[PDB]
Design a protein around this ligand. Structure first.
Ligand code: BGC
Ligand code: ZN
Length: 266
């Protein structure tokens, strides 16, 4: 019976783009292929690969349909995220979706995170109500000057509203993705690490969505809307609460080992 329907589908209301309309390779070009707008990138023992948006943004809906690799994927991260780390090295902002690979038999973990001026430790993790290796699913980051919302097939899984300037991303961000070896922490905090006998490790992305406002855009520009009612509807919130009740496996604000004073938005 799945999650309760969100009752509105932002992803379907925004034009699907091919990779080359929004993005170019950043690194590992030899581990990147594009076929009719669809992106394939992969990790082996010599290199991963990653890409970067052509434009730099001040707000928007940023979406892609992604398919993950099954089998042994421990230590491997497939990412889709906003960042300004190349603009503010060592003290940057970030809004992350990271798929954390796994040993055979166990599910992927989807981690969301927010970094402001170097300060992260704002992770929430869920498992999914479908197999993310079998088919492509929609995943999206919505970012405006009042909120961040993270979506899976238009189901909101997390909302991060602007509570104070110190705890919210207020500088321009680029979109990135990558497949890379994060063995030290990706899978059960590094309990299980990359094994290249199972290489390559492939990430697949298509139907890119950019309902967004570049830094250069006219001040009339509005990001794509995520509800016909201005705010999350009753159905959207119920779908989100169902996800958090039934699929959330980690929330920073509820971890007794974390000092929530350091993350005052909790
Ligand atoms: O994996 C995607 C991104 O997630 C976050 C971390 O700050 C980066 O090191 C990483 O590139
Ligand atoms: Zn405290």
């Amino acid at each position: 019976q799945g999650p309760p329907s969100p009752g509105y589908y932002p992803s379907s209301q925004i034009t699907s783009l091919g990779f080359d309309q929004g993005y170019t390779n950043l690194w590992g070009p030899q581990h990147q292929r594009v076929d009719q707008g669809s992106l394939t990138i992969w990790l082996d023992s010599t290199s991963g690969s990653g890409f970067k948006s052509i434009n730099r943004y001040r707000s928007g809906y940023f979406g892609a349909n992604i398919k993950l690799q099954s089998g042994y994927t421990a230590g491997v991260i497939t990412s889709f995220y906003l960042s300004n780390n190349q603009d503010y090295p060592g003290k940057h902002d970030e809004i992350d979706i990271e798929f954390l690979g796994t040993i055979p038999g166990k599910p992927y973990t989807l981690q969301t995170n927010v970094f402001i001026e170097g300060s992260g430790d704002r992770e929430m993790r869920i498992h999914l109500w479908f197999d993310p290796t079998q088919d492509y699913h929609n995943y999206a980051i919505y970012w405006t000057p009042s909120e961040i919302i993270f979506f899976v097939d238009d189901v909101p899984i997390r909302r991060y509203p602007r509570k104070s300037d110190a705890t919210f991303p207020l500088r321009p961000l680029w979109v990135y993705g990558s497949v890379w070896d994060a063995s030290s922490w990706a899978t059960e905090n590094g309990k299980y690490k990359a094994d290249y006998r199972y290489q390559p490790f492939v990430g697949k992305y298509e139907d890119f969505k950019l309902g967004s406002c570049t830094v250069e855009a006219a001040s009339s520009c509005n990001p794509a809307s995520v509800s016909p009612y201005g705010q999350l509807s009753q159905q959207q919130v119920a779908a989100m609460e169902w996800v958090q009740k039934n699929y959330m496996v980690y929330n920073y604000c509820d971890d007794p080992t974390r000092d929530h004073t350091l993350t005052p938005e909790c």
